[PDB]
From TrEMBL:
Family note: Belongs to the glycosyl hydrolase family 6.
Keyword annotations of the record: Carbohydrate metabolism, Cellulose degradation, Disulfide bond, Glycosidase, Hydrolase, Polysaccharide degradation, Signal
Enzyme Commission number: 3.2.1.-
Identification of the protein by name: Glucanase
Record's compositionally biased regions (Polar residues): 314-328
Molecular function in Gene Ontology: cellulose binding; hydrolase activity, hydrolyzing O-glycosyl compounds
Active site, per annotation: D89, D135 (proton donor), D313 (proton acceptor)
Organism for this UniProt entry: Phanerodontia chrysosporium
GO biological process assignments: cellulose catabolic process
Recorded GO CC terms: extracellular region
Disulphide-bridged cysteine pairs: C90-C149, C280-C327
């Protein structure tokens, strides 16, 4: 499109990720791997607002970015993930997250959004890009047979709508999570996906700030693959570019000239999964293409690092109440700590296996 949210902006670099990376570079036993590892702190990632407790961090990042913009004469951009739906991750093998549908969950979620908006409202000289609710809407395409998803459908739709409607009022550029090629990119899933995303866009008033969709968040697919990963057999859309090329025209037909962002943080190494749906801490993952607007696709505004690579996808401890057996499959790195916490051994492999090399 004409307006790429990133062009002309300096991304604010997460100080939290930078601190994790610096401490990790100290713990890596090879010295030459260490310089490459340390340089990861200069690579922009998204900050996940995975609880109300993270909202004050958003406020600090906005204020810090603004001051940095004034010091350097630049316009700064803060990258966030909205990730706190009630009954979050409805098709997972355990519950997670602070809000539940049964306990005022939607109303609590609205207040979470209100608190985020109230922060953003105070810092109008900082641009914000938000990924809206990974692992949410995509379940309402393919997983309506999971009873938790069926019973969450109206709440997911209302809560995502509230986020889009109210973040638009403060000019946040938004990309709604849309799974990946192996989830919604199957040709047969493209039409019901478009019907869903278009209805969501319509309900939120078709705001121009609703730019489009985010794909491959926290996942491992190639953007462009010279040969299909064997996990993809049966799906002609074997990488993210095929998925996006196929979905974008369906959105266009509804009057939404949608653009896309693609996570490549954990995509440096292909052909590592037994089954396409295996998502948790896949062994051998490497850091992929660094964030850039030089994407090679009319539809794609940016390659991004949405998941902060090195932070666990979930625990492999079957005694934890947060245990999802996906995190113990033969292709999941084990033992793995709780989601979001630092996974040093996994980071070290992301660095060593980074492609392009760091």
């Amino acid at each position: 499109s004409a307006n790429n949210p990133w062009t002309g902006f300096q991304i604010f670099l997460s100080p939290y990720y930078a601190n994790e990376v610096a401490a990790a570079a100290k713990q890596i036993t090879d010295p030459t791997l260490s310089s490459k590892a340390a340089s990861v702190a200069n690579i922009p990632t998204f900050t996940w607002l995975d609880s109300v407790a993270k909202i004050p961090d958003l406020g600090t990042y906005l204020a810090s970015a603004s001051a940095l913009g004034k010091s350097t004469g630049t316009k700064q951009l803060v990258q966030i993930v909205i990730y706190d739906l009630p009954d979050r991750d409805c098709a997972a093998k355990a519950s997670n997250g602070e809000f539940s549908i049964a306990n005022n969950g939607q109303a609590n979620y609205e207040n979470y959004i209100d608190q985020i908006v109230a922060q953003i409202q105070q810092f109008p000289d900082v641009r914000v890009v938000a990924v809206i609710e990974p692992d949410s809407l995509a379940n309402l395409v393919t997983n309506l047979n999971v009873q938790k998803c069926a019973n969450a459908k109206t709440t997911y739709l209302a809560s995502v709508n509230y986020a889009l409607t109210n973040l638009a009022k403060v000019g946040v550029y938004m990309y709604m999570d849309a799974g990946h090629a192996g989830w919604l990119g199957w040709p047969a899933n493209l039409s019901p996906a478009a019907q869903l995303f278009t209805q969501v866009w319509q309900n939120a008033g078709k705001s121009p700030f609703i730019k489009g969709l985010a794909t491959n968040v926290a996942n491992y697919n190639a953007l462009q693959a010279a040969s299909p990963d064997p996990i993809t057999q049966g799906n002609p859309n074997y990488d993210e570019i095929h998925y996006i090329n196929a979905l974008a025209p369906l959105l266009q037909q509804a009057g939404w000239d949608a653009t896309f962002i693609v996570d490549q943080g954990k995509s440096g190494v292909q052909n590592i999964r037994q089954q396409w749906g295996d998502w948790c801490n896949i062994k051998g993952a490497g850091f992929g293409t660094r964030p850039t607007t030089n994407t090679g696709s009319q539809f794609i505004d940016s390659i991004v690092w949405v998941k902060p690579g090195g932070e666990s996808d979930g625990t492999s401890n079957s005694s934890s109440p947060r245990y999802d057996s996906t995190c113990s499959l033969p292709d999941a790195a084990q033992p793995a700590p709780e989601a979001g916490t630092w996974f040093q051994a996994y980071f070290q492999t992301l660095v060593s296996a980074a492609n392009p090399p760091l």
